[PDB]
């Protein structure tokens, strides 16, 4: 019994998304979960749910909705899924194999693109081993790819692990910046703090 809209729109209309090495995580609680806002708004493409259908988001009571917001390349939008492995999902944002949730993405070329070159939406290039599901790797620690020890100095074979894609508006529709949000939630095991309008 609760009647107060939660900040879903905010999570979606947020002015600036974070880089995919440092993706945000909002605890949604005490919500009426009006999912009509998402698939009623204009672009909001690839509304892909797993273990749930997009229309069955109003007859449910979830335990703890998590909204994870970030920005990735257009080709990687498919790697933000269960059982995927490549460059993005291996070291920056691993989904678990048993994910119940909705991945939502929309083209943000009109919004996250500098014609002088964009150098603020970093992603991680080098990391020794995969991330476990829902791990944030904000480590700025340099990575040794050569036989020379890096000793706190960047250089040949001593890379900064983070670098930006670069987002020009004239970049191929394939790789323009895509804003992504990932709605994780658990189903029926506990007193639900979010429920659909009923």
């Amino acid at each position, epitope marked *: 019994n609760i009647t107060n809209l939660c900040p879903f729109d905010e999570v979606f209309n947020a*002015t*600036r998304f974070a880089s995919v090495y440092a993706w945000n995580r909002k605890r949604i609680s005490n919500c009426v979960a009006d999912y009509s806002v998402l698939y009623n708004l204009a672009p909001f493409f690839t509304f892909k749910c797993y273990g749930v259908s997009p229309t069955k988001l109003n007859d449910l009571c979830f335990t703890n909705v998590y909204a994870d917001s970030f920005v990735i390349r257009g080709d990687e939008v498919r790697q933000i899924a269960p059982g995927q492995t490549g460059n993005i999902a291996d070291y920056n944002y691993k989904l678990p194999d048993d994910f119940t949730g909705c991945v939502i993405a929309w083209n943000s070329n*009109k919004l996250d*693109s*500098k014609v*002088s070159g964009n150098y603020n939406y970093l992603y991680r290039l080098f990391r020794k081993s995969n991330l476990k599901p829902f791990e944030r790797d904000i480590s700025t620690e340099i990575y040794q790819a050569g036989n020379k020890p890096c000793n706190g100095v960047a250089g040949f074979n001593c890379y900064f692990p983070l670098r930006s894609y670069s987002f020009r*508006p*004239t970049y*191929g*529709v394939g790789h323009q910046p895509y804003r992504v949000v990932v709605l994780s939630f658990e189903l029926l095991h506990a007193p639900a703090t979010v429920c659909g309008p009923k």
Partner: antibody
Framework: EVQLLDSGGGLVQPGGSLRLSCAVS????????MNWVRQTPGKELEWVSA????????HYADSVRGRFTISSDNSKNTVYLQMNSLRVEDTAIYYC??????????????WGQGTLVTVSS | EIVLTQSPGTLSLSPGERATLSCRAS???????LAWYQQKPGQAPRLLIY???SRATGIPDRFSGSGSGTDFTLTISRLEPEDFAVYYC??????????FGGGTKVEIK
């Protein structure tokens, strides 16, 4: 449609300064860029300055680089065009206009009524 | 940089007929980042088409265009009196600077 109130046009002597403002209401300011474009009376339109939607990233046309200084504020929800040492070729109508993009590129959808700016002696 | 125009079609047409507007690019602009305004003699320009294939808000379906590579065409189906105005080329999406070509005046005769 977002409305735009272009204001601050006037007469200023060569070598003077002037302070244009374009008040804006009807969209999220921190989300879409503002552009500044001239048209000198009866000749072609020329772009002069632009500013990113956040408020930091700016550019200026080569005839006004180092003379014009753009600024904005998410508190009063407006863009400023501060300019110094105007020359006789700087006479125009100025139009403020929103671009489709957050950082300055792209095209301009909605345009102010525009303001007369005159330089004479 | 990117050049354009190639503007014949200023010939004074009469109200209510088909008029086609040529726009020739020199480098095959990418992602079809072209747009068209109209301005009447003493008022601010207003956007008509963007994406070189997408109509803006508050624009009658009377306006339409298409193009790709080096060649774009604004094709107006017919001509109400308020359409006797100047139309512009506007390549956008590179080192912005914005871009305004010579134009095209369609007048009455």
């Amino acid at each position: 449609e977002v409305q735009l109130l272009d204001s601050g046009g006037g007469l200023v002597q060569p070598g003077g300064s002037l302070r244009l403002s374009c008040a804006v209401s009807g969209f999220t300011f921190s989300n879409y860029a503002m552009n500044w474009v001239r048209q000198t009376p009866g000749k072609e339109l020329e772009w002069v300055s632009a500013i990113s939607g956040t408020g930091d990233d700016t550019h200026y046309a080569d005839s006004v680089r180092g003379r014009f200084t753009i600024s904005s504020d998410n508190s009063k929800n407006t863009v400023y065009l501060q300019m110094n040492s105007l020359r006789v070729e700087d006479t125009a109508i100025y139009y403020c206009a929103k671009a489709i993009s957050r950082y300055p590129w792209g095209c301009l959808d909605y345009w102010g009524q525009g303001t007369l700016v005159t330089v004479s002696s | 940089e990117i050049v354009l125009t190639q503007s014949p079609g200023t010939l004074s047409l009469s109200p209510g007929e088909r008029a086609t507007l040529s726009c020739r690019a020199s480098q095959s602009v990418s992602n079809s980042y072209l747009a068209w305004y109209q301005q009447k003699p003493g008022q601010a320009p207003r956007l008509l088409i963007y994406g070189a294939s997408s109509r803006a808000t508050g624009i009658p379906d009377r306006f339409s265009g298409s193009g790709s590579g080096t060649d774009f065409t604004l094709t107006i189906s017919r001509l109400e009196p308020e359409d006797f105005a100047v139309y512009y080329c506007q390549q956008y999406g590179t080192s912005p600077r914005l871009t305004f070509g010579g134009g095209t005046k369609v007048e009455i005769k």
